[PDB]
Design a protein around this ligand. Sequence first.
Ligand SMILES: O=c1ccn([C@@H]2O[C@H](COP(=O)(O)OP(=O)(O)O)[C@@H](O)[C@H]2O)c(=O)[nH]1
Ligand SMILES: O=P(O)(O)OC[C@H]1O[C@H](O)[C@H](O)[C@@H](O)[C@@H]1O
Length: 454
Amino acid sequence: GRLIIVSNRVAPIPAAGGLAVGVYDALKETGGMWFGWSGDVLSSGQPQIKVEERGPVTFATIALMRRDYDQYYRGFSNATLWPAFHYRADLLQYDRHDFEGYWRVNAWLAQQLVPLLREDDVIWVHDYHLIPFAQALRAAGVKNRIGFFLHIPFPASQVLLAVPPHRELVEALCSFDLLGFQTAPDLRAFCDYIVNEANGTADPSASGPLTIHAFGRTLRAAAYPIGVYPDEIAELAKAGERGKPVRTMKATLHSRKLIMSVDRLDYSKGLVERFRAFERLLEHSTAQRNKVSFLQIAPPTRADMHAYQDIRLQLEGESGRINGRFAELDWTPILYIHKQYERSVLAALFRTAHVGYVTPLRDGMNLVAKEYVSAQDPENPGVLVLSRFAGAAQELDGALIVNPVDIDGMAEALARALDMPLAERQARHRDMMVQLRENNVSVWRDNFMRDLQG
Ligand SMILES: O=c1ccn([C@@H]2O[C@H](COP(=O)(O)OP(=O)(O)O)[C@@H](O)[C@H]2O)c(=O)[nH]1
Ligand SMILES: O=P(O)(O)OC[C@H]1O[C@H](O)[C@H](O)[C@@H](O)[C@@H]1O
């Protein structure tokens, strides 16, 4: 059967975002179709699907009308769902008219997909934009198997209650044949809502996935943590070891140690707290001054949204304060760059960084954490400092796990990472590489597809 991937964001045919990276890694091996938004917005006219073969993948993409982009994507998806599911009800905005457009765009996108389907296609929908998609497909006569994978956290039921149409969203989720979440706590939160807010049931099974009964429907649900190709990232990082970015980075640092971060400039990424803990490191450790620099690559994301403009402004003021307090004529403590980089360049740079600094307030998985570890030279690997609220913390035992709210704790982790002896750095890296290898992105895809077809 042909695998049909459905997502809002489709890989570029460099972009920051782990969905596009991970889905493309999975899809290029099996081949199939990738259907979704082209990334373009129309002021007038009519969107038209564009079908194009790129090796084993068929891309089927379509623009959004401005009104659809505003209501479905900027509106309900990123002004309601994204903040709510990342435990930011304070940033949640809700507009009934945007929620209706969100529902309408899902139905319109499903209508665009129907003519391309075949009887034995297997449909795999990805992420929070497309929660109503199975319901729309079924209403359009579609009988294929349909699975869903949520890339972002599934919030605690009490937090989900802040989304006014929470019940309609969860009922729509129950039209899927199979629901996949990143981690066990995500699945637990879903089941907690089903049992305690939807009057349904969630039962274990010998097969693996739970059986869900709710809203008159029966379906399955399980956790499938998205992974990477760790040995592929290692070879990529090694192949850049004599490239210009690594060579100029080395020259600029001239023997100073490097703390490195790579994050869309999203309020979910805890970047203000991250900067404050680097500042706290410098306040308390005079020996670290002029001996380390912090590279934060923070590409623009969703920049036409006030909330993203706000977090950008806050972070830029942080960099100015901290640099102003601690800089010397030959030392800039924080190297803040508000631009996207090629993933191949980031891998090469990860391999030169003594510390990978990944401290999101909430994160469904965080591929950057897995990429940082994968890039390391096993003869001399750096240390991952990792938020306990990143989904990757459930499996990456060799990281230094921190609570991003605890500024002192994060600064102490930075000091511990910078001074960690080789033997322990290697032991942690070795353990994590085993985990990443056994639970790579091919295994993830095979596991979900096995459950969806069974
Ligand atoms: O300039 C950049 C920044 C990030 N990324 C990639 O974007 C992904 C980010 O995924 P992650 O899970 O860390 O976070 P997200 O953006 O999905 O919240 C990773 O594969 C990064 O290598 C990239 O290609 N270029
Ligand atoms: O697609 P954007 O809005 O640019 O955000 C980039 C990506 O961020 C996260 O990874 C989301 O889980 C993806 O669904 C999204 O594609």
